[PDB]
Design an enzyme around this catalytic site. Structure first.
Site, PDB file in Angstrom:
ATOM      1  N   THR C   1      38.684  -3.971 -19.444  1.00 16.19           N
ATOM      2  CA  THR C   1      39.653  -4.536 -18.468  1.00 16.19           C
ATOM      3  C   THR C   1      40.221  -3.424 -17.602  1.00 16.19           C
ATOM      4  O   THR C   1      40.241  -2.264 -18.003  1.00 16.19           O
ATOM      5  CB  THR C   1      40.802  -5.277 -19.178  1.00 16.19           C
ATOM      6  OG1 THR C   1      40.267  -6.349 -19.961  1.00 16.19           O
ATOM      7  CG2 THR C   1      41.789  -5.845 -18.172  1.00 16.19           C
ATOM      8  N   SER C   2      40.675  -3.785 -16.404  1.00 17.51           N
ATOM      9  CA  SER C   2      41.295  -2.818 -15.501  1.00 17.51           C
ATOM     10  C   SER C   2      42.392  -3.572 -14.742  1.00 17.51           C
ATOM     11  O   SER C   2      42.129  -4.196 -13.715  1.00 17.51           O
ATOM     12  CB  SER C   2      40.284  -2.203 -14.558  1.00 17.51           C
ATOM     13  OG  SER C   2      40.833  -1.088 -13.885  1.00 17.51           O
TER      14      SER C   2
END
Lengths: 223, 232, 181, 171, 201, 202, 218, 197, 236
Positions: C1-2
């Site tokens: 995830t970012s």
């Protein structure tokens, strides 16, 4: 309306609590007074041996009872437990005012919850802490009052009036533990209708004095 | 008669009589008032002197909850202390969960739910106190007043106790002729002395500007100024 | 995830990628990772406890009135990393981060997820206080595009939620748009 | 669990407390020759140095448990006044190195006390007869006198239950 | 540790060593390994016995007769099995049981028997008891047999020694026949018997 | 490291004041032996927090004892039994005068009264020397061919102080965890006397 | 996983000095740079904390609750019945021992008692407590204490240690810690609690006068 | 207490039971429509008889049996008659929404013992030992008979004497309890021979 | 004792419940609710007897949920208890079943609680009549009213209070002659206020009324200024 503690009268009174207050007026008079430095309990016992009216909670605090002794032992057990908890969790000598409020909050529960009954004992608590000498009067209703001096139990009104008229004097007794005890014994004498070495009991605590009780021969010099 | 011996019972009129008897208990209590100023609230109570032997100040009656809520009540003082202890528990729990001082309306609702719960069951007694409480929060100053029934409302000024009627008569004049916190303290002193008609005046207050929104007692020179104004 | 939350002149922009992975396999390449826990409070895990937090916040909104973003972060903490971003007219846009330790940190901008590691230096040099909406959007686009370019477990479209006094605005940017940045 | 408006809540055992021991006595009062007199335990032990003369059995069980618990906890014989506040009309009698020989009947220490229907006259007889100089022999004999109108606790013997025929003959 | 109890015509002989060790460090050489539960019950261990003594005092107060050895050993074995490496003998005399030894261990076993040896030196004590034990031993012979049996284990077993505490359980209660230092006892036995020939001196 | 010795109408309980973690010194004066009043001196070494909890709970228990028995002086055997029933990864030692006025040292459940007892890290360095010098172990009268043991005479409090000082000086020399100062508490009919002696600080 | 390292303190002739760096390290990543780890609890007490930052915030919450509950029904809570350093320390030690689900911290409670005695004590997740003229936590217990102990080797050195000497010693210890501790920051907070002047809390102090020139030769 | 006294009335309406203990044995006897067609062993050595509400006697007897076995399970030794009597009295005391309307005669022998035991329990939870006793209806009438035909200085010497005295007192089922777990009810023909004799 | 606890009298009547209905009228205020084409409006009399009261706090209309609003007739303590319980139930439903509780589901749940109080002798009934209003996601504008007996039913329009019968007659007359066909919530609010005035024969200031409007995705309460706008629009 008076058969239980959870019912108000049509005028808003709690008959059971008033009966518990009437219970105190059966017991013998006990007197309390203090200067700024010392606080004194003078108790009239009754017999057979006389029942001990004074109870010690700590080196810095103690109390005397009027009314049902078992209610007294329960309340003093709880008080000692609270002081022990305070020293256990903070190394802090529980303040006399806070101990009085703890008793107030314990006694109130019985006047609002069904199943129990109000504590039929009135207590005088004296102690010494950072704030000085203290004297609290505890009543079955839960009310606690900090006083210069007081008397509770049967026919205590005479001692209370004497203390009222003597207030200007015994407040000034700083550094003289014996004169306070003398004034107290003079006060309790007004509630009789007599004192003896074996009948009288005295307790004192103050700046240098830890809580100590005088009984038997120890009270002869004060009678 | 007969329907008023228990707490859970409705009368044929639809009234719960034990709560009305608890109200009767309140009306016997000493007079206490609260006044909402433009940025705070002021609390005052007449402390009747039972005897000359009472220490002249240390029998405090007004109570702080958390740091921004002040409570004053008339009636069975032990019940007032019980209610305030519950309020302190509620405020502590709220601060523990949400890291923020409990809002005054939220605190009022919690106390009202607690007091009303004592009117639900026959095994418990109604509170014998009407509690004026208030403080300052992110939304400003709030003043409330519980009744033994658990009912409450916000007030511009509140009074309860034996002299509640006279106190109300002068609160009406306050509201109709306006009240900063400094003036509010003096007006509270005047109202208490007028309602009294020996006793000790105890005043407290919580203003955004003059206490930074924290509840403090009136002491020393300000207390004496209120005393002499009211005597004036 | 970012995920990436950035307070700016008019509010807070919360943005994230759309890739979820189980090992090397992309389980879902179009996931919506921005979660609305309350009207103007959005969070981003770096699901069940999100429902629990929404439950507790609705209960709070009913009892005590509109919760703050700090209230939302507090509820996460007492139930428990999370980035909690929100807006209100008293506090304006706020960003809170709750890393795995469980501590809560109010920040001007926050980056989380595996992709955040690769853009610590970039965001530090490129962030500026009280940017405009367009400037904040471009900043988040560049940061997340680099995070996607480097993080294998990050990719797909870039989604943004812009929180402001005006309202909640959702944006989407496709790889054809940001990979060329 | 209720107070009255006046404020108050809504055989014959005779005991003497000498400085050489505390003597207890009870009228067994068997209802028939079939009831085995051996089983009329109206005087019971609470601890090695404490006993009492008579809800009964349950209270005695709890008192014995408290006494043994104290002895286990502190390795000291429980103070009689402490026992009374830690546990039928009662005469509790015991010995300790703090207050010596004690007899109790809320509680009040008594030099000598009697309970039961004969209490009203028995107390007057005790008031007229008791003196501090009583040696254990005269104490036992005065116990028997008042009964007609045994057990002891001693530093050497501890609690023991009563030779009684020899005492009635000596009486 | 080494503890032995055996029954003979004269009652029960209970002998124990005194050593306690923390690994190789000898913490103490005067530990009491026999607890006197009652004037008639000995608990031999190699809190539990405080509980048992409390229960025995309660039984003495409640019931007309003394607690039996069977009952005490069953109490202890039940308690141990509830918390299930230890071994104990409950040695005692009851008018309606005679001399009785009950072996109880941490596994929860409970065995009535004539002879039991427990502890790290138990095999060395058995070697002497089995070969010298008779039912008709005199009290002096049985006391010497217990002393010698503990001496053997103390000599050969590293974690056994210190001193031998002899107990004798008779119809009138247990008799404590004193403490014997294994240092003095070994040599005294060596001259009087002529045994331990391999030992120089 | 703590050390209790009973003697002729006296008892001493001594311990080093150093506090350590791993190979680092936390403090050089952390008192380890406590005068508990009633002419009882106590020390609960081992794991620090459990020792503190045990001492605190024992103080609570003795306060309740004073309550029930009207501030009576708690006897050493009563204190020992109380300490058992309260019992923590702790090795407690309490010392005082018994009801006969003789010095008494109690080591801890499973309490044991013993003439002397060491405890702690350097118990093994200290105790054998004290066996030799107090109990005269392995010493025989000269010229008796090992037939007559050296009689077990009693040592005065002065000689016991010397023995304690030398034992702790040796333990300080050869044990890295021992020695910044030596705290000695003498219990006698007069009361509890406290002495402090400096030890090497390396 | 978010933790703070350094807390050092010493007592001097008139009070106590305590300092700590403002950093929260996420393992090897110097993630957070604004964490405050000195928690004043009055004009007479400061609670420096190290270890898990989440537990540090929990402890801060508990301390504010103490300061709130002490003022209930206590008119002297301001001056005479105010919280002592010792009451706070015993409360915190009780909390740590209760949780010990231990709180993964080490706490130095520093202050001056109402009678004027300097209070300086340690407590950690195990409930181990001790007092000393100089205290340090974590990596400072190895580098900082040797430096501070050169100033006050024993109790008798405390009355001979002035305010400025202890201040410069603490500053030098922070400089050395920044030199040699990998999880430390250039920025630290410092609190002086003098018995006369009272709590004197300095924030955002700078480690200065660092020496790097000798690197050019290597 | 009022409810306990009403339970005593319920006991006094119940069918009478009688027990006599001789030198070697205890003997329990009991008083048992046209179309219709007492002593309970608690353990192999103790028997319990009762008078009063029969339904409540089953609760008591079940609890007593469970305790008698639980004692052997917790302690090796079987229950003493004294211990079982104390337990039964405790149960009766504890349930005083309503008490048991049951009074019990408890008889038997102690483990590895030979002195016969006979005990009584009543609804209040009181219990006592007796040499001969009766409970139930017209218990006064037959207790007065026992009080003069039973002799403390010459109690019944053998089973025949005990059974004879019991049958005379009742004037029928007879249970004889003897040491070493010997419990047996007399045959109808044997009881008939006693009655005719 | 059949009149002191919720048990049957020989007539089969539960007298405590019947007395609980009487309590609902003791606040002596009237309210009515009407359904628009796309919204629901509740009108309630805000009687403020004391001049020191803060009128902003005197309110018997509760925002139970984003979509559901509730107006209570009966004592304010019981009303607030009911409102808190309804808020809790609505939140718990949103949590358990993933969507906002429908108005009628909330009414049924509250009526089931009321029925529980009516059968367990330990607990007294609450003396409140609850009127839930919302614009349901499926059924559209909805009025559901619950009473102390545990009975509830949906309404085209409803009134409650001491003068319930008169307002009901007015609404019945209008419905016979004619939901209220309007194009926005302001017109239906004005209509509701007009019929309240006519039925009660009393003109209202901005202080005498409290108004709650249920619209798609929002239940909100009108402030005093908003009610003033409506009163002006009626005066015109």
């Amino acid at each position: 309306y008076d058969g239980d503690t959870v019912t108000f009268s049509p005028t808003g009174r709690l008959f059971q609590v008033e009966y518990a207050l009437e219970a105190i007026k059966q017991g013998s008079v006990t007197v309390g007074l203090r200067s700024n430095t010392h606080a004194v309990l003078v108790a009239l016992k009754r017999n057979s041996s006389y029942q001990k009216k004074i109870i010690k909670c700590d080196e810095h605090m103690g109390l005397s009872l009027a009314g049902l002794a078992p209610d007294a032992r329960v309340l003093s057990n709880y008080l000692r437990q609270q002081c022990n908890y305070s020293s256990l969790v903070f190394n802090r000598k529980l303040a006399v005012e806070r101990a009085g409020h703890l008793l107030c909050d314990k006694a109130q529960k019985n006047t609002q919850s069904y199943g129990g009954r109000p504590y039929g004992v009135g207590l005088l608590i004296i102690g010494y802490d950072k704030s000085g000498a203290h004297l609290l009067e505890f009543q079955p209703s839960g009310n606690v009052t900090e006083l210069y001096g007081t008397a509770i139990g049967a026919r205590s009104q005479g001692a209370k009036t004497y203390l009222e008229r003597t207030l200007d004097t015994f407040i000034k007794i700083d550094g003289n533990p014996d004169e306070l005890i003398k004034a107290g014994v003079e006060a309790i004498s007004q509630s009789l209708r007599s004192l003896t070495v074996d009948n009288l009991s005295i307790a004192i605590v103050g700046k240098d004095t830890p809580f100590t009780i005088y009984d038997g021969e120890a009270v002869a010099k004060y009678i | 008669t007969g329907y008023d011996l228990s707490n859970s019972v409705f009368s044929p009129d639809g009234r719960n009589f034990q709560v009305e008897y608890a109200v009767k208990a309140v009306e016997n209590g000493t007079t206490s008032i609260g006044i909402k100023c433009n940025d705070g609230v002021v609390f005052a109570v007449e402390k009747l002197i039972t005897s000359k032997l009472l220490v002249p100040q240390k029998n405090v009656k007004i109570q702080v909850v958390d740091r921004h809520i002040g409570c004053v009540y008339s009636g069975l003082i032990p019940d007032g202390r019980h209610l305030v202890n519950r309020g302190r528990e509620e405020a502590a729990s709220f601060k523990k969960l949400y890291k923020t001082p409990i809002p005054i309306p939220a605190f009022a609702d919690r106390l009202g739910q607690y007091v009303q719960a004592h009117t639900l069951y026959n095994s418990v007694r109604p509170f014998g106190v009407s509690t004026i409480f208030g403080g300052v929060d992110k939304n400003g100053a709030h003043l409330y007043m519980l009744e033994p029934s658990g009912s409450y409302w916000g007030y511009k000024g509140a009074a309860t106790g034996k002299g509640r009627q006279s106190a109300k008569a002068e609160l009406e004049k306050l509201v109709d002729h306006h009240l900063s916190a400094r003036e509010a303290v003096k007006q509270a002193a005047k109202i208490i002395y007028l309602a009294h008609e020996d006793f000790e005046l105890e005043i407290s207050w919580c203003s955004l500007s003059e206490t930074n929104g924290l509840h403090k007692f009136v002491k020393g020179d300000l207390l004496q100024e209120a005393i002499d104004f009211a005597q004036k | 995830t970012s995920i990436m939350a950035v307070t700016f002149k008019d509010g807070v922009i919360l943005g994230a990628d759309s890739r979820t992975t189980t090992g090397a396999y992309i389980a879902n390449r179009v996931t919506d990772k921005l979660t609305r826990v309350h009207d103007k409070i959005w969070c981003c895990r770096s699901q069940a406890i999100a429902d629990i937090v929404q439950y507790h916040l609705e209960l709070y909104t009913s009892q005590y009135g509109t919760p703050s973003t700090e209230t939302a972060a507090s509820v996460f903490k007492e139930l428990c990393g999370i980035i909690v971003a929100g807006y209100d007219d008293k506090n304006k846009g706020e960003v809170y981060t709750i890393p795995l330790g469980g501590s809560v940190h109010k920040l001007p901008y926050a980056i989380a997820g595996s992709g955040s590691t690769f853009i610590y230096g970039y965001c530090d040099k490129n962030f500026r206080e009280n940017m405009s909406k367009e400037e904040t959007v471009d900043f988040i686009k560049h940061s997340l595009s680099q995070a996607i370019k480097w993080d294998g477990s990050s990719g797909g479209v870039i989604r943004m939620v812009v929180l402001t006094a005006a309202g909640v605005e959702r944006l989407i940017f496709y790889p054809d748009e940001y990979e060329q940045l | 669990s209720t107070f009255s408006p006046e404020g108050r809540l809504f055989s014959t055992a005779i005991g003497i407390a000498t400085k050489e021991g505390v003597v207890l006595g009870v009228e067994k009062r068997a209802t028939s020759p079939l009831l085995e007199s051996d089983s009329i335990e109206k005087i019971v032990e609470i601890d090695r140095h404490i006993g009492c003369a008579m809800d009964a059995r349950s209270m005695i069980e709890h008192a014995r448990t408290a006494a043994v618990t104290h002895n286990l906890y502190y390795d000291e014989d429980i103070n009689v006044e402490s026992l009374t506040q830690s546990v039928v009309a009662l005469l509790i009698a015991g010995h300790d190195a703090d207050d010596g020989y004690q007899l109790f009947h809320t509680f009040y220490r008594y030099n000598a006390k009697a309970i039961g229907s004969g209490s009203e006259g028995a107390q007057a007889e005790l008031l007229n007869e008791w003196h501090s100089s009583l040696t254990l022999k005269e104490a036992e004999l005065l116990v028997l006198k008042i009964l007609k109108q045994l057990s002891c606790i001693t530093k050497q013997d501890g609690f023991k239950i009563y030779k009684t025929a020899e005492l009635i003959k000596e009486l | 540790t080494t503890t032995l109890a055996f029954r003979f015509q004269g009652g029960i002989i209970v002998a124990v060593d005194s050593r306690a060790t923390a690994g190789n460090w000898v913490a103490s050489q005067t530990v009491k390994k026999v607890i006197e539960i009652n004037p008639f019950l000995l608990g031999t261990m190699a809190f539990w016995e405080t509980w048992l003594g409390s229960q025995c005092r309660l039984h003495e107060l409640r019931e007309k007769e003394r607690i039996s050895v069977a009952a005490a050993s069953k109490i202890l074995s039940n308690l141990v099995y509830q918390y299930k490496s230890m071994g104990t003998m409950i040695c005692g005399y009851t008018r309606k049981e005679g001399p009785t030894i009950y072996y109880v261990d941490s596994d929860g076993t409970r065995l009535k028997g004539d002879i039991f040896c427990v502890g790290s030196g138990q095999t060395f004590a058995y070697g002497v008891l089995d070969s010298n034990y008779k039912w008709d031993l005199s009290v002096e012979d049985a006391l010497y047999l217990g002393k010698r049996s503990i001496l053997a284990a103390a000599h050969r077993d590293a974690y056994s020694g210190g001193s031998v505490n002899l107990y004798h359980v008779t119809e009138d209660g247990w008799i404590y026949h004193g403490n014997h230092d294994v240092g003095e006892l070994f040599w005294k036995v060596k001259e009087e018997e002529g045994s331990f020939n391999n030992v120089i001196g | 490291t703590i050390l209790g010795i009973a003697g002729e109408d006296f008892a001493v309980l001594a311990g080093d004041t150093r506090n350590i973690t791993d190979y680092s010194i936390n403090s050089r004066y952390e008192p380890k032996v406590f005068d508990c009043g009633d002419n009882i001196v106590m020390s609960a070494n081992g794991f620090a927090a459990d020792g503190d909890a045990l001492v605190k709970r024992f103080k609570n228990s003795v306060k309740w004892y004073h309550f029930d028995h009207n501030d009576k002086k708690l006897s050493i055997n009563s204190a020992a039994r109380n300490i058992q029933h309260l019992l923590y990864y702790v090795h407690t030692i309490i010392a005082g005068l018994d009801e006969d006025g003789k010095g008494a040292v109690y080591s801890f459940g499973s309490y044991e009264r013993e003439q002397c007892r060491a405890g702690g890290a350097a118990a093994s360095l200290i105790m054998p020397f004290l066996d030799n010098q107090v109990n005269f172990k392995n010493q025989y009268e000269p010229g008796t061919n090992g037939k007559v043991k050296k009689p077990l005479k009693y040592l005065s409090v002065e000689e016991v102080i010397k023995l304690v000082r030398d034992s702790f000086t040796s333990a300080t020399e050869r044990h890295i965890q021992v020695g910044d100062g030596l705290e000695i508490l003498i219990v006698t009919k007069d009361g509890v006397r406290k002495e402090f002696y400096e030890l090497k600080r390396d | 996983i978010v933790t703070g390292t350094s807390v050092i303190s010493m007592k001097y002739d008139n009070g106590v000095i305590i300092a700590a760096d403002n950093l929260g390290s996420y393992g090897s990543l110097l993630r957070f740079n604004g964490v405050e780890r000195l928690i004043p609890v009055g004009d007479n007490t400061v609670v420096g904390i190290s270890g898990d930052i989440s537990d540090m915030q929990h402890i801060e919450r508990l301390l504010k609750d103490l300061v709130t509950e002490n003022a209930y029904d206590n008119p002297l809570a301001d001056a005479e019945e105010a919280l002592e350093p010792s009451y706070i320390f015993e409360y915190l030690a009780t909390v740590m021992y209760q949780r010990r689900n231990p709180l993964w911290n080490a706490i130095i409670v520093a202050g001056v008692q109402s009678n004027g005695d300097q209070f300086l004590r340690y407590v950690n997740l195990l409930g181990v407590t001790y007092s000393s003229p100089t205290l340090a936590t974590g990596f400072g217990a190895h580098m900082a204490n040797p430096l501070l102990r050169k100033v006050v080797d024993r109790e008798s050195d405390i009355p001979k240690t002035t305010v400025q000497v202890a201040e410069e010693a603490i500053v030098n210890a922070m400089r050395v810690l920044y030199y040699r501790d990998a999880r430390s920051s250039r920025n630290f907070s410092l609190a002086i609690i003098d018995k006369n002047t009272g709590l004197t809390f300095k924030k955002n102090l700078q480690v200065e006068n660092m020496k790097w020139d000798f690197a050019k030769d290597i | 207490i009022f409810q306990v006294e009403y339970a005593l009335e319920a006991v006094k309406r119940g069918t009478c039971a009688v027990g006599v203990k001789g030198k070697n044995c205890v003997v329990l006897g009991c008083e048992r429509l046209k179309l219709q067609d007492k002593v309970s062993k608690i353990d192999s050595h103790v028997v319990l008889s009762f008078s009063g509400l029969n339904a409540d006697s089953r609760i008591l007897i079940e609890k007593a049996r469970v305790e008698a076995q639980s004692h052997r399970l917790t302690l090796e030794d079987p229950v003493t008659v004294e211990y079982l009597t104390r337990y039964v009295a405790g149960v009766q005391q504890r349930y005083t929404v309503r008490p048991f309307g049951v009074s019990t005669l408890i008889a038997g022998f102690d483990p590895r013992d030979d002195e016969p035991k006979l005990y009584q329990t009543e609804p209040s939870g009181i219990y006592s030992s007796w040499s001969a006793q009766t409970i139930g209806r017209n218990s006064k009438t037959v207790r007065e008979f026992l009080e003069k035909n039973y002799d403390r200085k010459e109690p019944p010497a053998t089973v025949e004497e005990c059974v004879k005295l019991t049958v005379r007192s009742l004037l029928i089922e007879i249970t004889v309890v003897k040491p070493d777990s010997d419990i047996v009810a007399l045959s109808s023909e044997e009881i008939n021979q006693y009655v005719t004799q | 004792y059949d009149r002191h606890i919720t048990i049957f009298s020989p007539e089969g009547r539960l007298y405590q419940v019947e007395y609980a209905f009487k309590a609902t009228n003791q606040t002596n205020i009237n309210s009515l609710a009407v359904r628009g084409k796309d919204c629901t409006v509740v009108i309630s009399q805000k009687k403020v007897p004391d001049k020191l009261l803060d009128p902003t706090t005197v309110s018997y209309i509760f925002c139970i949920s984003r979509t559901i609003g509730m107006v209570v007739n009966g004592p304010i303590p019981d009303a607030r208890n009911a409102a808190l319980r309804a808020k809790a139930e609505a939140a718990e439903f949103r949590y358990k079943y993933g969507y906002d509780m429908p108005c009628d589901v909330l009414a049924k749940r509250m009526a089931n609680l009321s029925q529980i109080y009516t059968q367990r002798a330990y607990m007294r009934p609450l003396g409140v009549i609850l009127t839930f209003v919302s614009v349901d996601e499926e059924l559209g504008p909805s009025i559901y009213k619950t009473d102390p007996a545990g009975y509830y039913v949906g309404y085209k329009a409803t009134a409650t209070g001491p003068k319930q019968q008169e307002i009901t007659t007015n609404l019945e007359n209008h419905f016979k002659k004619s939901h209220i066909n309007e194009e926005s919530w302001e017109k239906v609010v004005e209509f509701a206020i007009t019929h309240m005035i006519d039925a009660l024969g009393t003109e209202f200031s901005k202080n005498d009324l409290e108004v709650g409007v249920a619209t798609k995705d929002k239940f909100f309460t009108l402030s005093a200024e908003n009610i003033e706008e409506r009163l002006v629009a009626i005066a015109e």
